[PDB]
């Protein structure tokens, strides 16, 4: 356990309590600092230690630690709490500053867990002018994150570009996954997009052709 | 009020060296340690090191030990960080964060040694080794099944372009669109070192039938004149 480890992602609905964990050696006997970083902004020091927190910072943020684990507890989560969170420790013996791996937290729309609807992105015009054809999959209206999307069950990793998701106004996610191949290949062989969405325990396989 | 102001965004090349300034205000410069900590896009925070403005002394991490030098000017109350022998994975946002000297208790009331109580706004630093390339713009009309769903989504795909900076605008009946489309970008850093962009313009079916014509316009640096890709029913 050389560094500080945190769960990569935590999601919670408004009004709930979010508990973020931090792992390390002899952390309970140490002071643990928690920083918050909203998208495109600088980190801010949220919790120095336990309930000791800087000026102008909500009483809902509280710190804790026992043995090898520490915990940032966010009581009554609000939409504004949606940001990345980093635990941090200082070893005064070797004068080392260590951050955590980071925890992306999200405030849910409280929408029902929904399986994705994958529509085909068919090439016709694009194939022609380029000398290279772009075909794809439009994975629409799923919740929550994430989905994994392969092509031909992993038979090709060459031209595939899997884009990040976006949060629609419906509170659901839209995903795009494209791949580029020559027209010659486009004519003869089959192209299957394989969508695997764990949170709904479903999966779809869609055929993309001329 | 206490504030830290860093130098503007900078663009460099592999092998070169970058310098970043940090201007402190609203407090005693010599009373606090000044740290430098960076983060790569979509990565975690990584401590680079500290300088003590009062004595000028420094302490670097073992990773950056040889390449980085942190200096200071007390007169203008400014700290500096220089990174040499730059490579591509040094591409990151660089923050300067203040941390209380354990030997200097302040009248502020909040004695927080070991923590970074104040952060700068950050400085963007890019290392390329990549030529400037125009996008490959493709377009996709909505699938028939999606039309059966009642909604329609047209997709604009800008492929293998450099740099990130690009403009996308949607035209229905030669008319500019605002407040409908959403977009996303992927950085492939392996070979191309380029960014691919997916834009999705979403309308209802009714507007889709009643409007009768669709085009996607894109303006980029690497291309001479704005490229428009068009498509329609038929």
Residue numbers in the entry:
A (entry chain L): 1 to 210
B (entry chain H): 1 to 234
Quote what the paper states about this structure:
A generic approach to assemble two different heavy and two different light chains into a bivalent, bispecific IgG antibody (“CrossMab”) without artificial linkers was recently reported. Correct pairing of two different LCs with their respective HCs is achieved by a CH1-CL-domain crossover in one of the Fabs. To reveal potential structural effects of the crossover procedure on the resulting bispecific antibodies, we report the crystal structure of a human Angiopoietin 2 (hAng2) binding “CrossFab”, i.e. a Fab derivative in which the VL domain is fused to the CH1 domain, while the VH domain is fused to the CL domain (“CH1-CL crossover” in). For comparison, we also determined the crystal structure of the corresponding “uncrossed” Fab.
Selection of the elbow crossing points aimed at maximal preservation of the native elbow structure, together with maximum sequence conservation to the native elbow sequences. Since the lengths of the HC and LC elbow sequences differ by one amino acid, the longer alternative was chosen on both the crossed LC and the crossed HC to avoid steric constraints. The crystal structures of Fab and CrossFab, determined at a resolution of 2.2 and 2.9 Å, respectively, exhibit, as expected, the typical Fab geometry. Although the diffraction data quality and hence the obtained resolution is slightly lower in the CrossFab, the resulting electron density allowed unambiguous model building. The molecule regions directly affected by the CrossFab design, i.e. the elbow and adjacent regions, show clear electron density in unbiased composite omit maps, indicating a defined geometry and low flexibility. The CrossFab structure shows clear electron density in the elbow region, indicating that these engineered portions of the CrossFab are well-ordered. The two molecules in the asymmetric unit of the Fab structure exhibit elbow angles of 138 and 145 degrees, respectively, whereas the CrossFab molecules in the asymmetric unit show 163 and 167 degrees, respectively. Most importantly, although one of the elbow chains contains one amino acid more than a native Fab, this does not cause a tilt between VHVL and CH1CL domains. Moreover, no significant difference in the kinetic parameters kon and koff was found, indicating that the structural features relevant for target binding are maintained in the CrossFab. The lower thermal stability of the CrossFab might be attributed to fewer stabilizing contacts between the variable and the constant domains in the CrossFab compared to the Fab.
